[PDB]
Amino acid sequence: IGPEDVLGLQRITGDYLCSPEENIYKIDFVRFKIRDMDSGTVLFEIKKPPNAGRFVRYQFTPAFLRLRQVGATVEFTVGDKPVNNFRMIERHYFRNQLLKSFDFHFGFCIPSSKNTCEHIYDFPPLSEELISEMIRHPYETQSDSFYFVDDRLVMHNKADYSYSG
Amino acid sequence: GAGASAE
Secondary structure (H helix, E strand, O other): OOHHHOOOOOOOOOOOOOOHHHOOOOOEEEEEEEEEOOOOOEEEEEEOOOOOOOEEEEEOOHHHHHOOEEEEEEEEEOOOOOEOOOEEEEEEEEOOEEEEEEEEEOOOEOOOOEEEEEEEEEOOOOOHHHHHHHHHOOOOEEEEEEEEEOOEEEEEEEEEEEOOO | OHHHHOO
């Protein structure tokens, strides 16, 4: 799977597009934090010291949906193989309506090391009807996170969201 | 989805 195989998707995938063992670079996300860039509020943070740890569910408030910009801090370790052109394409849908796709290129990845990246999400302006529907139907908003190293898919994580606070 | 792994 390459970036061209996901950049036009109009629905959540019916399954994971790669197996865990496709992660030959041993990329392991060890911290993920999201902060509202307009208030400094930390909206979510997690650290670690059958899905297989690839699905996460979020519980945010209805105010999330009116945010302008969110900053995500990612920490990850990397194994001993050099990692070049590490890229995430992450696509968010409500009921299979594409809300936004974010395409992030990680900076340089130091092998055999903990690395950090900051991703800035600029939220799409959502119509009032969408925001009300997404608040009313928790977990029907979902995302696919597709991670590529040298244009090949190495990790695929899934998420779903509630805004029912 | 980076939040999945971090748990």
